[PDB]
Amino acid sequence: NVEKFEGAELHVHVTGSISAALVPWWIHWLREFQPELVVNVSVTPAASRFLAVRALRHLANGKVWVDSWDDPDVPPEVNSGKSGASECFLVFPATLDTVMRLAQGRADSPALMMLQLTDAPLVIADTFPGSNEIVENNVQTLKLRPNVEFAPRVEVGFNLPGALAAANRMRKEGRS
């Protein structure tokens, strides 16, 4: 049930769960599955303790940068909600904290400024250890944004093929 992303370029935002260690394998998979796709990647300091940014610079064909206002590779168009010509944004994986920061309008990292300002489909491949009533409320708050969805389950949302299908879906709804 695995389908191709119908756009030309997407952006992957990688956050600090142990699943980030598995992302270079999935980026490699997506590059072989769809060689014409341009894949940009942002990586949080936390995630950079679980993978090597250097390896992504090799596996990914788009821009690769650490999600930090002091990193010189951070492209200027983050301040307009863009990543090159990315047509969707996948948070893969997405920590509890990254989702709380998104739900709260925070722009304390250039990737979060970018995710606050984008109108493009934004898919969240959540990897939460757990939840409570206050977390669930902050997740509900994200329905105020029409472009945001959580990826299809596999109880956890670490699901790139599902994220790609959800993205192609929200892309075609944005045209008709």
Choice from 16, 24, 62, 81 touching ligand FAD (CB under 6 A): 16
44 touching ligand FAD, by CB under 6 A: yes
How is residue 18 annotated by DSSP? G
Choice from 40, 95, 147, 159 touching ligand FAD (CB under 6 A): 95
Nearer to a second copy, 31 or 171 (CB): 31
Distances from the Cα of 149 to the Cαs of 54, 66, 169, 170, in angstroms?
29, 24, 11, 9
Nearer to ligand FAD, 39 or 47 (CB): 47
Q: DSSP characters for the chain?
A: -----SSSEEEEEE-SSGGGGGHHHHHHHHHHH-TT-EEEEEE-TTGGGTS-HHHHHHH-SS-EEESSTT-TT--GGGGGT-STT-S-EEEEEE-HHHHHHHHTT--SSHHHHHHHH--S-EEEEE--S---HHHHHHHHHGGGSTTEEEPPP------HHHHHHHHHHHHHHTT-
166 touching ligand FAD, by CB under 6 A: no
Nearer to a second copy, 144 or 176 (CB): 144
Stretch that binds ligand FAD, among 33-41, 44-52, 81-89, 132-140 (CB under 6 A): 44-52
- Show the binding pattern over residues 147-176: x = contacts a second copy (CB under 8 A), - = does not: ------------------------------
Which residue ranges make up the site for a second copy (CB under 8 A)? 16, 18, 20-22, 24-26, 28, 46, 48-52, 54-56, 58-59, 69-70, 79-81, 95-97, 100, 103-108, 113, 116-117, 129-130, 132-135, 137-138, 141-142, 144-145
